[PDB]
Amino acid sequence: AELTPEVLTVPLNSEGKTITLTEKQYLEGKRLFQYACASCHVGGITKTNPSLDLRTETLALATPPRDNIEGLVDYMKNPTTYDGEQEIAEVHPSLRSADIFPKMRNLTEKDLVAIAGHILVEPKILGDKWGGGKVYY
Amino acid sequence: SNSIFATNRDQESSGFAWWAGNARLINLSGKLLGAHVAHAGLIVFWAGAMTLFELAHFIPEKPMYEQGLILIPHIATLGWGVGPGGEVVDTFPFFVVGVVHLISSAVLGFGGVYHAIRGPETLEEYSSFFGYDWKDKNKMTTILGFHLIVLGIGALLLVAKAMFFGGLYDTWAPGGGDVRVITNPTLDPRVIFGYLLKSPFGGEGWIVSVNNLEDVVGGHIWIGLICIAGGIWHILTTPFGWARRAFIWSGEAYLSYSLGALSMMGFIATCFVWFNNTVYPSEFYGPTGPEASQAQAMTFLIRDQKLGANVGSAQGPTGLGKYLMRSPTGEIIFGGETMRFWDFRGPWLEPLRGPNGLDLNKIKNDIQPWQERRAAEYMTHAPLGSLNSVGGVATEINSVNFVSPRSWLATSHFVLAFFFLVGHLWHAGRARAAAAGFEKGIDRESEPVLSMPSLD
Amino acid sequence: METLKITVYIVVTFFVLLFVFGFLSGDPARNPKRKDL
Amino acid sequence: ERGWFDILDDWLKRDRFVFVGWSGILLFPCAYLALGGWLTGTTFVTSWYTHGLASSYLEGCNFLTVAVSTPANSMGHSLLLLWGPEAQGDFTRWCQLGGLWTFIALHGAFGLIGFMLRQFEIARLVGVRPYNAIAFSAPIAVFVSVFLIYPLGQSSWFFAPSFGVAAIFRFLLFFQGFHNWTLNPFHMMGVAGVLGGALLCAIHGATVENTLFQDGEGASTFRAFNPTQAEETYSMVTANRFWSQIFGIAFSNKRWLHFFMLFVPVTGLWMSAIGVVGLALNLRSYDFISQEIRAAEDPEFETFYTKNLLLNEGIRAWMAPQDQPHENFVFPEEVLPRGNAL
Amino acid sequence: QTANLWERFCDWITSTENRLYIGWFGVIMIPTLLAATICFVIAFIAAPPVDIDGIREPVSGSLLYGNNIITAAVVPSSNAIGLHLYPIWDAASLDEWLYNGGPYQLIIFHFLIGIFCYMGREWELSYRLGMRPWIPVAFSAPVAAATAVLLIYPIGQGSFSDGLMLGISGTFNFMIVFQAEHNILMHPFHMLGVAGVFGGALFAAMHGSLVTSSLIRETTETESTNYGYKFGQEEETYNIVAAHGYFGRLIFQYASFNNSRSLHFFLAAWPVVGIWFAALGISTMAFNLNGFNFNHSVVDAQGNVINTWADIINRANIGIEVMHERNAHNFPLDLA
Amino acid sequence: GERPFSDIITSVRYWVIHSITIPALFIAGWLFVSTGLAYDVFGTPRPDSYYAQEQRSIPLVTDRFEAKQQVETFLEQLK
Ligand code: CLA
Ligand code: CLA
Ligand code: CLA
Ligand code: CLA
Ligand code: CLA
Ligand SMILES: CC1=C(/C=C/C(C)=C/C=C/C(C)=C/C=C/C=C(C)/C=C/C=C(C)/C=C/C2=C(C)CCCC2(C)C)C(C)(C)CCC1
Ligand SMILES: CC1=C(/C=C/C(C)=C/C=C/C(C)=C/C=C/C=C(C)/C=C/C=C(C)/C=C/C2=C(C)CCCC2(C)C)C(C)(C)CCC1
Ligand SMILES: CC1=C(/C=C/C(C)=C/C=C/C(C)=C/C=C/C=C(C)/C=C/C=C(C)/C=C/C2=C(C)CCCC2(C)C)C(C)(C)CCC1
Ligand SMILES: CCCCCCCCCCCCO[C@@H]1O[C@H](CO)[C@@H](O[C@H]2O[C@H](CO)[C@@H](O)[C@H](O)[C@H]2O)[C@H](O)[C@H]1O
Ligand SMILES: CCCCCCCS[C@@H]1O[C@H](CO)[C@@H](O)[C@H](O)[C@H]1O
Ligand SMILES: [Ca+2]
Ligand SMILES: [Cl-]
Ligand SMILES: [Cl-]
Ligand SMILES: [Fe+2]
């Protein structure tokens, strides 16, 4: 098995546009995800709220849809609850709350795109193990 | 001349093998002075070099405790380089501390190497002031007194920092942790020495329970004066008869007493960094074990209450409250396994506590986002991790590179305190046997047991 | 319970005092060789 | 005119840096191949086709996780000879099938025979009684029961221990979860013999070293001993009085003391081997029937014995799908036993 | 005179003629070990069930309440108590004290004081006998290990309910939970511990067999060879040159001890240092610096995890984790 | 009757010989890996050879006597 361009091709938006990530992009996304997110989202779960995971099918049913680059980049700027009704930047790391989540302070647009691409590619590699928790370890 | 055994630095002259070679120094005051000063250089070298390494690796926007730092936390706790909430506002004080220790270690190393190999091997012929005989009890208490005075000055330097040169970092500062100048140190001896008579068991915690900087500073005012007074005392007196008859008077005996002392201090430091979050602020060292466990219960209380749960009336599977229950003396505390940690206190939690324990009205209405943030952060930085620094429980998968500074500092100092207790036993037993004249074995022609009546 | 507590405190204090004053009573000289310690 | 057998006997028994002997003809090749096989396999050879596991430095494992793993369960108890019907002379396939496991186990067994024979041979040539050989029967009983009899009773070599650090730890936990091996009195006697042997080792060495006679002037006392001296170097009389007054009893006979130091660990290992022979057949000390009758009828009755069975049930359910891949276990999330929250 | 009557007492306390040495350490050791032993025996036989995990789920430890020798234990004090000291006089009644695991605290605290004084007492008598002083240094290894599991580990985890449970099956429960929570098998200090006890047993058998192998002939074919040694004889009873000649040929010459003092120092040092490290393993996993974690360390070119034996260990650890104390956790992480 | 090792390893002749043979053996072992030959001698998967691109199942041997042909089939399904 290999990390191919096809594996690295992920939805850019809800309209069906795709983007093919570079291997460097994916690796940067993995590194930045560890830096800023893995303390709560290791392996695709959510330690402080296990009901919501990072599976693509879960992201697809969030409001607005989070199963694409633009959706995930927007989430990292202005996170909401799963139904989109409430903005939660005060308790979830984001560019909007980089004052209180300092690890977000230096993230560029390119960095957010890389993190988003990691979240979409990882279940393409790991399948149900991503977001699976200890049952799938 | 051209003989390998021609010096006194061999087993033939000294009676000690190479693996006990530093025992050849017991009665060589000059070279032994060199060894001590050179070793001081090594300590100071490490403080300086390690700080610069930490600073070179330091990313000021990540928490210190995500970065394997143990020295910069010590400097920051003194109020250098940090602002509200423990945020780093200036790394230059860290740089200064590192540089000045590193430069100073060169001076100590110079003097150590000089005294160890070039200077006079024994000092007594050169100076009656610096020369000494281990069996000279007055000289021994005089040198002890000098060093007691030095230690008292050291304690007063902390006070000077806290009261006149910027203050200290106060995790408890009203409105949020911040640097604060201490103006009213606790001088009341009933408080200061009350700590020394507290039980070390749960809910009491002996001196490890010190929970405010006024007691810390006032305690160091007391230790400073006590040490200076005791030092003057020991320069002006010699041991009383009852002390003379109680102790062994030899270099190795004195070493053994200090080893027992340092072992005890090491065990105390282990508990201090594991439990105390006042002089080891969680902003710099990460949450304590009790703290992170409490923070998990707080996190899911917040989450579930937001979903509509009545956390006061929610019965858990055992019949005890799933979120809230009573301690054995009735205080309202967090439920689940963290019932054991109800003695925990921390600034993010105390706003929710009233006279009866956790206040359900405040829990329902007054939890702020910064408290939810702090509890989530501390729950996810619990001091659990692997030896290769994989953070989390032992079943965690690789991803998070984390072992808490509290775990590094507690484990190292338990290991060190333990071997120093072994060293105390070793050298105390040897000093007794050597003073009595049988540390090399039983005299075949005068075996004590052969002169004793049989047991039966 | 209060009578038990006082009893145990006295008992503990008694044995600890024996230990401390015992080891203060010229223990270095209680050996088979050099007793001028 | 001597005869080639005696001339060979002469050369084999020459006093040289490494004694050879007749026993060396068996010992040296088998020990070398067993050790060489383990180093070769842990450095270069996978366990992908037998276990679904990486197991070599070449694949990225470290010293703690490398192993030479057992063959697949489908091999049964095949000798798995290089020229046998499974590998058919193909060295690469032989490695992929697990042939290095039986290679190491069997050369290892014959090497251990060679070593015990060496102990006999050297004792006979030097003229001492062969108690060292007799004591070595305990390592042999352990190796034979654990690496040969146990898998021979089970379905295949697959369930023998794999030759690796972490692989052996897995074997320990498997024996807890499936056999409740800690509850077995033969294992308990083994534990007593090992910990009791280590106790005897420490206390005897410490006692000798702290009842030495002063036979020199040095503060380091090792130099004050002469191998040819007639005298004891420490005082048996003072040691006996010390332990009599500290512990209540003491050795008084040096010969018994040293035989007892052999007897305790040797007997303990022998007992543990017997328990493993039972486990070859799943003849476990798994349960106490009276405990199970009471707990089944009385849901308030709980002991540490019932608590440990719940742990065993967790081990079995959560480790079996990956640990026994030939079974193709699929345990849906909902059937996995687990407590609250975790 | 007070000073004479006191000196008579000191002379009796420190007397080398008492069948069992008392000494000043013995003045503390004797009452504390007696209190711990008496309480332990009574509790092991007759104590009612104890709510070890503070969830009103009492575990029966005593023989009279349905245990045998293998399953019985004295059960730790309740998780609701944590590290609080729980003496009898802080309980409303003996009934309450028993429900909450009071006996365990009384036993372990008196026992620990007692074994530390036992260690000092080993120093003390050696001093009275004119011996060298380091037998208590050897005994410090088991003392350190007992202190790790009865005191340091519960302190680090915040509760005596997590200390070693005082029974045979209770010990196994402690061990299995410990493996899930610290991966102790993958911790190098436990590995050193194993080398210590495996090696100690090996060297005991080795030393025992080599001395036994070279006993000098002093008995007839009928009597035990043990009669060939007489207690207190001056001459050595075996031929150490013969023993060395065998062992140096078994391996190679320079691998064998010909110095009996070096040999016996090694016999002391190997198990003692090994057990020191074992004890430090428990005492540092007490602060959650845990065994090596190689879970998912091996990854293929695409990013799939390739399991190692470390991952199989992890599956067993998880099975223990999810099952242990099955009613005690309400939140997703077991953080102590 | 043979020379002590300490005499041998402190002699110039020993180090003239072994300053060549020890590095040569080290380099040959290096190349055994770096050329990839170690993979093919022992049959160890390269990082891209544990799984085919679509399936995520282990090529476990299930047939005792046709295991050799079974491995040969699992390998042909990779490329
Ligand atoms: C903290 C570590 C430490 C220190 C400070 C010392 C210090 C000392 N040792 Mg001990 N020793 C140690 C560890 C230490 N030792 C250890 C770990 C062992 C076991 C291997 C020993 C075994 C041992 C034996 C057997 C003996 C000593 C002796 C000595 C003394 C004389 C040394 C001498 O004459 O060397 C001469 C060596 C040289 C001249 C070589 C150069 C040495 C210098 C000091 C190196 C300086 C390097 C440094 C980078 C320079 C910086 C310069 C810059 C600041 C300007 C000296 C006071 C001897 C003694 O007691 O004499 C009475 C003695 O016989 N030691
Ligand atoms: C109080 C002592 C102490 C403590 C608590 C720490 C703690 C830490 N160090 Mg520091 N450090 C220390 C002393 C200490 N160090 C010393 C003496 C040096 C000079 C070598 C350093 C140089 C150093 C560097 C260069 C780095 C650290 C780093 C770190 C962090 C990662 C630790 C790690 O991965 O260890 C791994 C654990 C081991 C290697 C285990 C060692 C086990 C020893 C050998 C056991 C010894 C037992 C006893 C002492 C000997 C007894 C023998 C017996 C026979 C008597 C952690 C915060 C890292 C960091 O993150 O910095 C930002 C880092 O890069 N440290
Ligand atoms: C505790 C450490 C210590 C002690 C007890 C000594 C003691 C001695 N030294 Mg040594 N030395 C030391 C450290 C020490 N030195 C260091 C760190 C260096 C490197 C600079 C040297 C380099 C050195 C040399 C080159 C010589 C000596 C000499 C001597 C002898 C005569 C000293 C004298 O008469 O000064 C008289 C006192 C003064 C002149 C005033 C001293 C005031 C000092 C400088 C400042 C004190 C401030 C404060 C207390 C320091 C705190 C430091 C702390 C933060 C670490 C005497 C035995 C001489 C000797 O042995 O001749 C044969 C000699 O030639 N020393
Ligand atoms: C480095 C610190 C240090 C050291 C090593 C010494 C050493 C000495 N002192 Mg000095 N002393 C010091 C600091 C020090 N002192 C200070 C700072 C002061 C001012 C307060 C004094 C005031 C002082 C006086 C007035 C006297 C001494 C005396 C002595 C000598 C015998 C002391 C003794 O028997 O201790 C052992 C202690 C005892 C035998 C008392 C019983 C100890 C109990 C049982 C131990 C309890 C410990 C507890 C568990 C640990 C903390 C818990 C507690 C807080 C509740 C000895 C040379 C005596 C002497 O002859 O001087 C000329 C003496 O009369 N010292
Ligand atoms: C001490 C020497 C020794 C011993 C005891 C073994 C033992 C073993 N080897 Mg190892 N091996 C050795 C040295 C040894 N090896 C060396 C030096 C090498 C490197 C060349 C190897 C390389 C090797 C490989 C590659 C393999 C083995 C394997 C084995 C196992 C199967 C052996 C077999 O079936 O042989 C059968 C052959 C014999 C038993 C020969 C017996 C000859 C008889 C006695 C002659 C009788 C003649 C008769 C009297 C004449 C009658 C005449 C008539 C007309 C009257 C067995 C455990 C296999 C294995 O481990 O699989 C897992 C395997 O694959 N060995
Ligand atoms: C006696 C003896 C000994 C010991 C010794 C010792 C221990 C010594 C020490 C010494 C020392 C202790 C030294 C030190 C030194 C130091 C130095 C020399 C430093 C310098 C510094 C610098 C040069 C810096 C620079 C810088 C800056 C300024 C800034 C930042 C950057 C940098 C870092 C670059 C021994 C063991 C051998 C044995 C024999 C005898
Ligand atoms: C700073 C501070 C503080 C304070 C502190 C203090 C004030 C302290 C003091 C301390 C002290 C004040 C201590 C002391 C100690 C003591 C000791 C440690 C003793 C010991 C003893 C001994 C060791 C003895 C022995 C013996 C015996 C018993 C018998 C006889 C013989 C002999 C002598 C050997 C506080 C906490 C507030 C807070 C924080 C900060
Ligand atoms: C199998 C087989 C075989 C054989 C082979 C061989 C015989 C091999 C050998 C091999 C070898 C023979 C190898 C070796 C290797 C080695 C190594 C790989 C080493 C390493 C080491 C190290 C790494 C070290 C470490 C350490 C220790 C251990 C302690 C001290 C410290 C140190 C760190 C030094 C044959 C052909 C018959 C056939 C086919 C099969
Ligand atoms: C940190 C808390 C500090 C609290 C204050 C501590 C003060 C300590 C004062 C120590 C007083 C010592 O008191 C000491 O007791 C015993 C009483 O027989 C004496 O001990 C004496 O015992 C016998 C005679 O019976 C002799 O063999 C021995 O040589 C002699 O020393 C000491 O000679 C005496 O000086
Ligand atoms: C303005 C035209 C409307 C379509 C283009 C703008 C919205 S595009 C939209 O971006 C969202 C995050 O912002 C995602 O939820 C969504 O999947 C993505 O398609
Ligand atoms: Ca000399
Ligand atoms: Cl459990
Ligand atoms: Cl919980
Ligand atoms: Fe012996």
CSV table of N, CA and C in Angstrom, one decimal, chain D residues 88-128:
chain,number,residue,atom,x,y,z
D,88,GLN,N,9.7,-27.1,1.4
D,88,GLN,CA,10.2,-27.8,0.2
D,88,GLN,C,11.5,-27.3,-0.2
D,89,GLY,N,12.4,-27.0,0.7
D,89,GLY,CA,13.8,-26.5,0.4
D,89,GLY,C,13.9,-25.1,0.1
D,90,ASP,N,12.9,-24.3,0.2
D,90,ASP,CA,12.9,-22.8,-0.1
D,90,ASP,C,13.2,-22.1,1.2
D,91,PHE,N,14.4,-21.5,1.3
D,91,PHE,CA,14.8,-20.9,2.5
D,91,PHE,C,14.0,-19.7,2.8
D,92,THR,N,13.6,-18.9,1.8
D,92,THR,CA,12.8,-17.7,2.0
D,92,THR,C,11.4,-18.0,2.5
D,93,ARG,N,10.8,-19.0,1.8
D,93,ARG,CA,9.5,-19.4,2.3
D,93,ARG,C,9.5,-20.0,3.7
D,94,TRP,N,10.6,-20.8,3.9
D,94,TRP,CA,10.8,-21.4,5.2
D,94,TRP,C,10.8,-20.3,6.3
D,95,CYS,N,11.5,-19.2,6.1
D,95,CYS,CA,11.5,-18.1,7.0
D,95,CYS,C,10.1,-17.5,7.2
D,96,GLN,N,9.4,-17.3,6.0
D,96,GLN,CA,8.0,-16.7,6.1
D,96,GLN,C,7.0,-17.7,6.8
D,97,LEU,N,7.3,-19.0,6.7
D,97,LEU,CA,6.4,-20.0,7.4
D,97,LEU,C,6.7,-20.2,8.9
D,98,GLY,N,7.8,-19.6,9.4
D,98,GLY,CA,8.1,-19.8,10.8
D,98,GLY,C,9.1,-20.9,11.1
D,99,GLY,N,9.8,-21.4,10.1
D,99,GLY,CA,10.7,-22.4,10.3
D,99,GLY,C,11.9,-22.1,11.3
D,100,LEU,N,12.2,-20.8,11.4
D,100,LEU,CA,13.2,-20.4,12.3
D,100,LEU,C,12.8,-20.7,13.8
D,101,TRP,N,11.5,-20.7,14.0
D,101,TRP,CA,11.0,-21.0,15.4
D,101,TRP,C,11.4,-22.4,15.8
D,102,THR,N,11.0,-23.4,14.9
D,102,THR,CA,11.3,-24.8,15.3
D,102,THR,C,12.8,-25.0,15.2
D,103,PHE,N,13.5,-24.3,14.2
D,103,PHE,CA,14.9,-24.4,14.1
D,103,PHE,C,15.6,-24.0,15.5
D,104,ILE,N,15.1,-22.9,16.1
D,104,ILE,CA,15.7,-22.4,17.3
D,104,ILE,C,15.3,-23.3,18.5
D,105,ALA,N,14.0,-23.7,18.5
D,105,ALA,CA,13.5,-24.6,19.6
D,105,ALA,C,14.3,-25.9,19.7
D,106,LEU,N,14.5,-26.5,18.5
D,106,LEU,CA,15.0,-27.9,18.5
D,106,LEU,C,16.6,-27.8,18.6
D,107,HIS,N,17.2,-26.9,17.9
D,107,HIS,CA,18.7,-26.8,18.2
D,107,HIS,C,18.9,-26.3,19.6
D,108,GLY,N,18.0,-25.5,20.1
D,108,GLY,CA,18.1,-25.1,21.5
D,108,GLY,C,18.0,-26.2,22.5
D,109,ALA,N,17.0,-27.1,22.2
D,109,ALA,CA,16.8,-28.3,23.1
D,109,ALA,C,18.1,-29.2,23.1
D,110,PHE,N,18.6,-29.5,21.9
D,110,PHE,CA,19.8,-30.3,21.8
D,110,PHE,C,21.0,-29.6,22.4
D,111,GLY,N,21.1,-28.3,22.2
D,111,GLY,CA,22.1,-27.5,22.8
D,111,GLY,C,22.1,-27.6,24.4
D,112,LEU,N,20.9,-27.5,25.0
D,112,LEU,CA,20.8,-27.7,26.4
D,112,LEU,C,21.2,-29.0,26.9
D,113,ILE,N,20.9,-30.1,26.1
D,113,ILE,CA,21.4,-31.4,26.4
D,113,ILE,C,22.9,-31.4,26.3
D,114,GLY,N,23.5,-30.8,25.3
D,114,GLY,CA,24.9,-30.7,25.2
D,114,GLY,C,25.6,-30.0,26.3
D,115,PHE,N,24.9,-29.0,26.9
D,115,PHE,CA,25.5,-28.2,28.0
D,115,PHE,C,25.5,-29.1,29.2
D,116,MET,N,24.4,-29.7,29.5
D,116,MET,CA,24.3,-30.6,30.7
D,116,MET,C,25.4,-31.7,30.6
D,117,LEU,N,25.5,-32.3,29.4
D,117,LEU,CA,26.6,-33.2,29.1
D,117,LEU,C,28.0,-32.7,29.4
D,118,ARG,N,28.2,-31.4,29.0
D,118,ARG,CA,29.4,-30.7,29.3
D,118,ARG,C,29.7,-30.6,30.8
D,119,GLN,N,28.6,-30.3,31.5
D,119,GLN,CA,28.7,-30.3,33.0
D,119,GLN,C,29.2,-31.6,33.6
D,120,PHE,N,28.6,-32.7,33.1
D,120,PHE,CA,29.0,-34.0,33.5
D,120,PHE,C,30.4,-34.3,33.1
D,121,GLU,N,30.8,-34.0,31.9
D,121,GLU,CA,32.1,-34.4,31.4
D,121,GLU,C,33.2,-33.6,32.1
D,122,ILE,N,33.0,-32.3,32.4
D,122,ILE,CA,34.1,-31.6,33.0
D,122,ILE,C,34.2,-32.0,34.5
D,123,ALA,N,33.0,-32.2,35.1
D,123,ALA,CA,33.1,-32.7,36.5
D,123,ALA,C,33.8,-34.0,36.6
D,124,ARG,N,33.6,-34.9,35.7
D,124,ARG,CA,34.3,-36.2,35.7
D,124,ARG,C,35.8,-36.1,35.5
D,125,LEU,N,36.2,-35.1,34.6
D,125,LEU,CA,37.6,-34.9,34.3
D,125,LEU,C,38.3,-34.2,35.4
D,126,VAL,N,37.7,-33.3,36.1
D,126,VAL,CA,38.3,-32.5,37.2
D,126,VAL,C,38.1,-33.3,38.5
D,127,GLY,N,37.2,-34.3,38.6
D,127,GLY,CA,37.0,-35.1,39.8
D,127,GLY,C,36.1,-34.5,40.8
D,128,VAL,N,35.1,-33.7,40.5
D,128,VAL,CA,34.1,-33.2,41.4
D,128,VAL,C,32.8,-33.9,41.2
